[PDB]
């Protein structure tokens, strides 16, 4: 049994949403065979004009049939087989935040749309995850559209309307935390009068609202939380943004204009991976393509405390000088896994990474189908994070061993240079020494000997002081980079990948209770794989997190205690050979005071 249509039909069965105006069912055409997102119930007006609409961030309305048997009105859609923006965050994956790269493409497509709508004079009113489909491109990268918008949630409403640019904040902050900015205790259900007041308690600059107790305080927030997956550099972009969109009054509210144009410049922006080699940090500089290094310099800076002049970039094995005109759009391209690593002459403290450390919630042995559903997605998302960080570690450390091998190799450059200095000094010495003895009212030749001699002396010193350095820079000299490769985790060992098979197990386990949520009721034969699914979903957790605290954190701490000392010992070494080659050039400069002096005496 289903309904049909002149040119489409659909299965009852193969319902997509359910609202209360009407029903989307999954349904093909009766002539191609193609799928579409059919809609079953001054129309005829206003659908009309929603044909004409076109645009990448909306769903093209295509046509309005009339169905057979009870001549509804039917909206023929563009169908997303991917979901809705909700759909993608109920994974476990997502449950702590969405991709750097993922949210990007969500507020490209989210300001995309509304601008278009705008530009037309349609105001959404609703604006939720709900609302925002997801569709593969052709390219492989989602596209997001909307689509619901004619006639809205309760926890996307402004203060005033409880009783636009409000749902759109809570939107951005719900894909960027994997959480809602203003959740009470007991959720916004019982607790929808503390739910207000958390909004009418406006303390604009601040963003979110944790209620962590019954009918406790409201712990405000100003910043994104430290479970955050986006980038340090993209947080201090994206703040300000939801702050002044965040407040019930219109005076201090930004509209889309001042919106539009903020939003433009996060997104106009190029990404340049910077590495902190002496932090053990990496960071994200957003930075438009026509800014030049100066401006580079400053937001390396703000996100690393390090002066600008004392900003010393690698890459690729070379030292890498940045002209401070230099557009951003010609510098070298970097990547996670090939940033430009920063190191200072200035001591620099050693942090490392910054996360949130959760433990795992305890399972209850209530057999309840929404019980276990609700568990399983929280269980599954922590396993998502520590499987995120495991990675991270990894990413960090690997980072480290090419940083290290890479700088020792930079200051063994600046060795050979001095080398090359002290050939010329040496040569120079040897050939004005030796060039007096040949030609030897004597005491303008004698005080040149007690200070040639002086200089051959002190010359010889930077000589035994650098061959030690050469001897610190050989392997096993106090200061080789072999400790790295055998302190902490390393991908053989393949820890990000053990996390990901017990966090596929645990993903199938919540997969089917979320299954087992849509039934009302299970038989006994699958209530009982229920209960002993529920069972193996907490010895897989129980093994992820003994697996990532006593292997992952353990082995990273002891390479980040390690580094930390090698970092004193590498810096020390930096200060002797500067110092080495600077009593190389004040003498260079010492022999030139010589050479021409008595050498070149006067007489016609
Ligand atoms: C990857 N798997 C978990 C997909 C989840 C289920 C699903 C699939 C396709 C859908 O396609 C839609 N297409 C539309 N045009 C509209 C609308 O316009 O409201 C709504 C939907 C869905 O909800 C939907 C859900």
């Not at 359910?18 to 193609?34: E, I, L, P, S, Y």
């Not at 479970?227 to 201090?252: M, W, Y």
Request: with cysteine; glycine share 6%.
């Amino acid at each position: 049994a289903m309904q049909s249509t002149s040119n489409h039909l659909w299965l009852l069965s193969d319902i997509l949403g359910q609202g209360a105006t009407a029903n989307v069912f999954r349904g093909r055409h009766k002539k191609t065979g193609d799928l579409f997102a059919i809609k079953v119930f001054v129309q005829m007006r206003e659908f009309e004009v929603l044909k004409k609409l076109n645009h990448k961030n909306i769903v093209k309305l295509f046509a309005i049939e009339e169905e057979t048997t009870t001549r509804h009105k039917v909206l023929i859609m563009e169908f997303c087989p991917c979901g809705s923006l909700y759909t993608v965050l109920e994974e476990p994956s997502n449950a702590y935040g969405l991709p750097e790269s993922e949210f990007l493409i969500v507020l490209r497509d989210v300001v995309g749309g509304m601008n278009h709508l705008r530009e037309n004079g349609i105001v959404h009113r609703d604006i939720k995850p709900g609302n925002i489909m997801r569709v593969i491109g052709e390219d492989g990268q989602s596209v997001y559209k909307l689509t619901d918008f004619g006639a809205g949630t309760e926890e996307y409403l402004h203060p005033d309307m409880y009783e636009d640019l409000w749902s759109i904040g809570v939107t951005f902050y719900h894909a960027a935390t994997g959480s809602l900015p203003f959740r009470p205790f007991e959720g916004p259900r019982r607790n929808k009068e503390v739910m207000y007041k958390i909004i009418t308690g406006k303390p604009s600059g601040a963003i979110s609202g944790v209620q962590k107790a019954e009918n406790g305080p409201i712990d405000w927030s100003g910043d994104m939380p430290v479970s955050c997956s986006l980038s340090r550099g993209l947080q201090v972009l994206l703040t300000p943004v939801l702050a002044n969109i965040l407040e019930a009054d219109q005076e201090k509210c930004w509209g889309f204009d001042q919106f539009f144009a903020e939003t433009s410049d996060i997104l106009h922006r190029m990404v340049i991976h910077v590495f902190s080699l002496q932090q053990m940090t990496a960071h994200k500089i957003y930075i438009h393509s026509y800014n030049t290094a100066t401006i580079f310099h400053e937001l390396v800076y703000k996100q690393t405390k390090i002066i600008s002049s004392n900003q010393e970039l690698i890459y690729e094995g070379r030292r890498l000088v940045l002209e401070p005109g230099r557009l951003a759009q010609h510098f070298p391209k970097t990547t996670e896994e090939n940033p430009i690593f920063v190191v200072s002459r200035e001591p620099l403290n050693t942090i490392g990474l910054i996360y949130e450390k959760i433990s795992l919630p305890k399972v209850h042995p209530r057999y309840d189908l929404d019980g276990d559903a609700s568990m399983a997605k929280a269980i599954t998302g922590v396993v998502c994070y520590a499987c995120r960080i495991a990675s991270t570690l990894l990413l960090y450390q690997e980072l480290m061993r090419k940083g290290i091998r890479w700088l020792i190799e930079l200051i063994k450059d600046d060795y050979n240079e001095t080398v090359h200095k002290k050939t010329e000094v040496v040569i120079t010495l040897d050939f004005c020494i030796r060039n007096i003895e040949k030609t030897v009212e004597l005491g303008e030749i004698s005080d040149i000997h007690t200070k040639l001699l002086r200089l051959s002396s002190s010359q010889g010193t930077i000589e035994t002081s650098l061959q030690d350095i050469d001897s610190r820079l050989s392997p096993g000299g106090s200061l080789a980079d072999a400790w790295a490769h055998q302190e902490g985790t390393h991908p053989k060992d393949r820890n990000v990948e053990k996390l990901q098979v017990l966090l596929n197990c645990m993903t199938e386990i919540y997969y089917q209770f979320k299954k087992d949520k849509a039934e009302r009721r299970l038989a006994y034969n699958e209530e009982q794989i229920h209960k002993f699914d529920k069972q193996k979903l907490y010895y897989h957790a129980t093994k992820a997190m003994t697996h990532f605290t006593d292997e992952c954190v353990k082995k990273y701490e002891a390479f980040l205690n390690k580094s930390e000392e090698w970092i004193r010992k590498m810096l020390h070494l930096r200060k002797q050979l500067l110092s080495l080659t600077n009593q190389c050039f004040d003498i260079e400069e010492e022999v030139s005071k010589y050479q021409e002096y008595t050498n070149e005496l006067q007489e016609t």
